[PDB]
């Protein structure tokens, strides 16, 4: 159960980062990170897939209700690979990922605010920031985490967000999933060299997941070892 | 600048279509729009033209377009937000597949599971050209009137 919660994020992920690490500002604010970079990045055979990530909170006008909300330019595999359940609708095709449709995913709570009526979501349009957006899918949270006190959150194909309501080449991050059952330790340094190449400087700054995965795996199985062993010893004593 | 003036006998709209779609949008194509504040009160008219000079909001260039809506009763304040529907073509007598259940092998080939009269779902490869914001105009490989398991489809799966 707990591993399924953990492996729910698969194998693996190398989110791309600027600056130095998590706490950095200006060097992290600047991003020499073309989404085009992914091309050659996706070119490596061991990789199964790798995906762009970006997000922007913006004001959202609508009919009468008129409030800002966070939003998330992402892959269509997002709710898929996260396995996030849908309140309604689906994610989106890669074709329409290229289609730049004004399709979009929203919080159920966001609907709770927008829609006292509980009107059907699909086919409806609501502007984000400025651009009109024909809402379709909305997804229920797959975690409780009530202490998070989650606010309004929204999801877009990244091509649309970063594209036709941002236009920057530099997305917040890029997920990178390896194939082959390949080890987390290896190649991440090779990708590091890769960023030492396609960029001229030490700018990978990425975090990684079979490291923490394998170690918590050894941890849990170790707990199995202690528990089952002392149990069986006691029973043999019986 | 002592004082500004404006003629409100008719209202012009600045419909900022994205640069990706500007290549289409032939003049005189019929279009309609509606304001956020009145929810449902459609206005409509001919498109007039396209402005030669773009202006941008950081990322992504946008090109304007204009109408010429009549303004009875003194409604529509200046710079009011207005959602705008511009019309592309209406080819007819042809099926379009909802995108919710599409299968797309190769990214060219396109399998699609559909329920049969037997209660057996079965997929078929199909070719499709035209694509829509919501669906895709299928051209071959599926009959009209066919049941189509839009939700949680799998091939060969009798229900």
């Amino acid at each position: 159960m707990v591993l399924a919660d953990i492996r729910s994020i698969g194998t693996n992920t190398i989110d791309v980062y600027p600056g130095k690490d998590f706490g950095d500002d200006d060097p992290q604010y600047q991003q020499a990170l073309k989404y085009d970079d992914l091309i050659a990045i996706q070119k490596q055979p061991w990789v199964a897939s790798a995906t762009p990530a970006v997000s922007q909170n913006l004001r959202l006008r609508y009919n009468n209700v008129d409030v800002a909300a966070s939003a998330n330019g992402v892959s269509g595999d997002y709710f898929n690979v996260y396995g996030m359940t849908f309140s309604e609708g689906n994610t989106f095709n890669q074709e329409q990922l290229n289609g730049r449709a004004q399709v979009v995913v929203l919080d159920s709570n966001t609907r709770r605010q927008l829609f006292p009526h509980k009107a059907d979501v699909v086919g409806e349009v609501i502007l984000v920031g400025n651009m009109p957006a024909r809402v379709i899918g909305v997804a229920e949270e797959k975690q409780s985490m009530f202490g998070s006190s989650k606010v309004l959150r929204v999801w877009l194909p990244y091509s649309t967000m970063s594209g036709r309501v941002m236009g920057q080449s530099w997305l917040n991050s890029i997920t990178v999933r390896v194939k082959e059952g390949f080890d987390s330790a290896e190649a991440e340094q090779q990708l590091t060299r890769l960023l030492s190449l396609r960029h001229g400087k030490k700018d990978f700054f990425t975090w990684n997941m079979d490291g923490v995965l394998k170690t918590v795996e050894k941890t849990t199985r170790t707990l199995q070892l202690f528990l089952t062993l002392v149990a069986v010893i006691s029973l043999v004593v019986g | 600048n002592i004082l500004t003036l404006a003629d409100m006998s008719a209202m012009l709209v600045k419909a900022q279509v994205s640069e990706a779609d500007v290549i289409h949008l032939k003049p005189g194509q019929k279009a309609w729009f509606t304001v956020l504040g009145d929810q449902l009160t459609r206005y409509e008219g001919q498109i007039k033209d396209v402005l030669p000079t773009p202006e941008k909001v950081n990322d992504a260039i946008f090109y304007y377009a204009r109408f010429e809506v009549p303004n009875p009763n003194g409604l529509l304040r200046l710079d009011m937000t207005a959602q705008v529907h511009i019309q592309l073509t209406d080819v007819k007598n042809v099926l379009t597949i909802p995108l919710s259940a599409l299968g797309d092998p190769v990214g060219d080939n396109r399998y699609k599971v559909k329920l049969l009269r037997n209660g057996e779902t079965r997929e078929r490869e199909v070719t499709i050209g035209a694509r829509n914001d919501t669906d895709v105009e299928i051209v071959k490989g599926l009959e009209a009137g066919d049941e189509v398991v839009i939700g949680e489809a799998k091939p060969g799966a009798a229900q």
Binding site: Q102, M131, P132 | N93, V94, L95, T96, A130, E137, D146
Partner: peptide, 22 residues
């Protein structure tokens, strides 16, 4: 486990491609 499937009746439809814009 119910094999229940959401489904639709396809018909010779007419194209409604036009898009939108703020």
């Amino acid at each position: 486990p119910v094999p229940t499937y959401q489904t639709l009746i396809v018909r010779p439809g007419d194209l409604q491609q036009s898009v939108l814009a703020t």
